[PDB]
Ligand binder design. Sequence first.
Ligand SMILES: CC(C)CCC[C@@H](C)[C@H]1CC[C@H]2[C@@H]3CC=C4C[C@@H](O)CC[C@]4(C)[C@H]3CC[C@]12C
Ligand SMILES: CC(C)CCC[C@@H](C)[C@H]1CC[C@H]2[C@@H]3CC=C4C[C@@H](O)CC[C@]4(C)[C@H]3CC[C@]12C
Ligand SMILES: CC(C)CCC[C@@H](C)[C@H]1CC[C@H]2[C@@H]3CC=C4C[C@@H](O)CC[C@]4(C)[C@H]3CC[C@]12C
Ligand SMILES: CC(C)CCC[C@@H](C)[C@H]1CC[C@H]2[C@@H]3CC=C4C[C@@H](O)CC[C@]4(C)[C@H]3CC[C@]12C
Ligand SMILES: CC(C)CCC[C@@H](C)[C@H]1CC[C@H]2[C@@H]3CC=C4C[C@@H](O)CC[C@]4(C)[C@H]3CC[C@]12C
Ligand SMILES: [Mg+2]
Ligand SMILES: [Mg+2]
Ligand SMILES: [Mg+2]
Lengths: 48, 96, 132, 163, 48, 96, 145, 145
Amino acid sequence: TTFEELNTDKFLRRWERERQEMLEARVKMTNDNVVQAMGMMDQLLEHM
Amino acid sequence: EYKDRPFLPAPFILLAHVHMLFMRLLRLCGVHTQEHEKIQDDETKRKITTFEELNTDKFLRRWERERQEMLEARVKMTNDNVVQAMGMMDQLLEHM
Amino acid sequence: AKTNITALDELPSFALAIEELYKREAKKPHSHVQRLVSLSNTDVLGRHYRGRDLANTRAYNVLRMDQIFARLVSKDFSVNRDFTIYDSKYDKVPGIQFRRTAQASHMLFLWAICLDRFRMARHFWLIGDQSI
Amino acid sequence: ADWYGHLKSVTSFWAVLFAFFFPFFVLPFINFSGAHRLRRKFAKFYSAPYTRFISDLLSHFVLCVVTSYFVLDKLEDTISAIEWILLVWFVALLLEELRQMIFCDGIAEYISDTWNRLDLIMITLFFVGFFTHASDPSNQDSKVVSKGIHAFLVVVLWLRFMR
Amino acid sequence: CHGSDSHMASEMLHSKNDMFNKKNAINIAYDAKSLAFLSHPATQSVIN
Amino acid sequence: INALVASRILERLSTHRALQGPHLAEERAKMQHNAKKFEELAVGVLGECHGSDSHMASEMLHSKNDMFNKKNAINIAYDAKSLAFLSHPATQSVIN
Amino acid sequence: YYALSKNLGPKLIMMMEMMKDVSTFVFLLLIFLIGYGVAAQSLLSPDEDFSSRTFIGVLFRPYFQIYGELFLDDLNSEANCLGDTPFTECSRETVRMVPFFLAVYILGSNVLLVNLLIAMFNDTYMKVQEAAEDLWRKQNYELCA
Amino acid sequence: YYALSKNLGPKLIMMMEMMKDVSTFVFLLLIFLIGYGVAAQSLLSPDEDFSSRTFIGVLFRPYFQIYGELFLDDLNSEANCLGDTPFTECSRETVRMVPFFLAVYILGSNVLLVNLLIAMFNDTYMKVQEAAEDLWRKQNYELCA
Ligand SMILES: CC(C)CCC[C@@H](C)[C@H]1CC[C@H]2[C@@H]3CC=C4C[C@@H](O)CC[C@]4(C)[C@H]3CC[C@]12C
Ligand SMILES: CC(C)CCC[C@@H](C)[C@H]1CC[C@H]2[C@@H]3CC=C4C[C@@H](O)CC[C@]4(C)[C@H]3CC[C@]12C
Ligand SMILES: CC(C)CCC[C@@H](C)[C@H]1CC[C@H]2[C@@H]3CC=C4C[C@@H](O)CC[C@]4(C)[C@H]3CC[C@]12C
Ligand SMILES: CC(C)CCC[C@@H](C)[C@H]1CC[C@H]2[C@@H]3CC=C4C[C@@H](O)CC[C@]4(C)[C@H]3CC[C@]12C
Ligand SMILES: CC(C)CCC[C@@H](C)[C@H]1CC[C@H]2[C@@H]3CC=C4C[C@@H](O)CC[C@]4(C)[C@H]3CC[C@]12C
Ligand SMILES: [Mg+2]
Ligand SMILES: [Mg+2]
Ligand SMILES: [Mg+2]
């Protein structure tokens, strides 16, 4: 039971890690980061 | 094709043929046969029209959303955002 | 309301809450859950025997749904429920918090499979046990 | 849904075929969609396009089997009963071809279909062979030439059965 | 499970579960008509 | 030569009696994977040699090495059952 | 007992899958076989009463002519043609159309239908090879249990 | 000595690879050949003592009938059927099932198994063509050494 639960957590953790190394997910995450970066620049420009 | 064809098979389809010929003769010369049909209401027509327009907007909205989740469009949009970000940095550097 | 059946009266509060979730989804138009319960041809306890007020007011109890799912899986599905462990006298037992969690999650898991909500199903599948 | 008309979509070929062969014994015990109800059940089952397609298939299959038997069995010295039945059947087929020609969307739409062309070849071959036999029914040579023409007829009929 | 410890995974696949009248997971998978689970190398190794 | 040696040792170890066991399966798989990778390296370096100077690469492939009782690299590759190295155009040019 | 083997068991499973294509070929072939058989049997023996021998004549040669065994010497003998050239100098001119009907028929059966069956087999094989391996792995458990 | 050539040597290597598919076909074909041969030999010559000729009769015609050479005139002669139509007017009614068994058998062998073998050959060819080229390049060195 302990072995099965530990391996369930390991496969799900590995699955999430593998899905984040996909090209589509990385491009989407990079895109959201650049959008959040522009929002922070708007704040920076307001301060100048 | 088989919606409009008479039901009766080929040795017995002559009865169906003379029956239709008899109906045609009663309608053209005698004109003693009345025909009845059904016409759709304006309410159900406007319901179908409203449904079709709503689904047209939904497919186009879904299509635009799907096209923005493509890899090429996301890379292009990300590229334009980084270019606009550099322009804003030029403004920031001017202010310092 | 109080019931003469000793099995239904033994049921905890969260089972009645899952019954409320089934009822809210069931009152919606053209819901497949209500059709499934009606075509199941079972009694209040889920036994395949085919009063009336009790059979309609409590038609979505967890035991009856368990019986419907039991016939749906195979000829030998039989989940053993133990609602006696939710009493305060079993608090001193070490692993009980896991068991209470696992059982609860399992019941909610089956409900999420029935409504075809995959995300909720995957989350309740992850918290409980016997994953495979 | 248009194919099955006012009948349930779970009906198979054998069930509809059995109900066609046994109208008063298979139709009540089938649920879909008392002169009030029995007449309604007939009018719904027999107004469906699927039932008409099945009736046409069975009819064309008997036509193929009966015409095949007619060509294989020897011709008599007069026009036989089976020859008269086939004559009535092919005039009816010719009238059906005329009926589909008049009520379609033009002569071009009809002649585009390969099966209508096959139908014209069927009617033309049978009438040539029949008049060849009927010109001199006691002539042995006429029977031989008539069976020779009707050899092509049976081939086209079985080809037309692939529709 | 097969990646972490194959023998313990075999023990897990041979374990009788109370929820299906005391029989193992491969019997459950066959009864559920899961072709993908049955075609997996770990399951095939236990069957061999 | 070392890449060929690495490929041969991993391939022989992966089917050896010492690596049979329930816990060594993934390890065995890893050995096979690593063997192919080292084989690829041996091909790659060889390709680079043939790109720079083909005649000097031919001289390198004909050179007798002391580590294998004074015989050349193609004999070593054949003994290591490296099909990829033997199928390479540089090796085939030397053989022709 | 071939199913234990890693080569024969999956091929057994593919054979059962290809039986549907064989049945499809039989249904398409039945049209030409019955049509040519009735036509050819009527041309070879006219002015004859229908019997069981007529039905056997309809079924026998047409089926075995698609496997390359041509009954042309036998058909020539049955046609009562006495010339050195085979379907010439016959009693009736209609029986000389037998080699022509046959000419269409084996073009329909061997040239067209058999090669189509080869194409269906190749396509079917590529489609269901992985499924056959999966089915073999399930039947491995079935035989073990 | 064909292995030196860039066309024949890889094809030689493919031939050796296709031998396994040929062996698979032989194992599948053996079932129908032995079954039909024992059944057909028993139907053609009943009430006869077992001998070496019985075994030769089981093996001889069944194997050569899958290549299109039908022994129907010879089988008709052995069946003692005297009618103009071939498997009619026989001494025993059981021997009239010979053309039917045969009808199933060549359907099993030529229609089903041969076309399946064509599919296995095409799939096998596409799978191992690059490996055959690689194997030819290794055998080039082997012949040179
Ligand atoms: C439309 C297609 C499929 C049919 C072709 C037409 C057929 C029915 C016609 C065309 C020419 C005809 C032949 C012309 C002349 C003769 C010679 C006569 O002594 C016997 C009949 C025979 C042998 C005819 C048989 C029928 C025939 C073959
Ligand atoms: C489309 C294809 C597969 C049609 C199948 C053809 C079958 C039905 C035919 C082809 C050859 C035929 C056989 C030929 C000869 C004889 C001998 C006779 O004394 C009894 C019938 C018998 C045994 C026939 C039975 C039916 C038969 C097997
Ligand atoms: C299928 C259709 C489209 C093709 C038409 C070709 C047919 C009608 C032709 C091709 C070969 C022809 C036969 C060739 C030879 C002879 C001998 C002659 O003394 C009488 C007619 C007869 C017996 C012909 C009848 C018509 C025939 C069968
Ligand atoms: C490229 C291929 C398809 C060419 C086609 C060949 C055709 C045209 C040939 C092949 C065999 C021929 C037949 C062989 C024998 C006879 C008997 C003779 O008394 C009349 C003509 C007739 C009936 C021939 C008609 C033409 C024929 C059917
Ligand atoms: C393989 C199974 C499913 C198909 C069944 C078809 C078999 C049983 C049929 C097809 C052809 C049949 C034969 C056809 C003709 C005759 C001649 C008759 O005077 C005696 C029976 C006999 C000899 C039949 C025996 C049964 C038979 C062999
Ligand atoms: Mg868990
Ligand atoms: Mg028509
Ligand atoms: Mg041949």
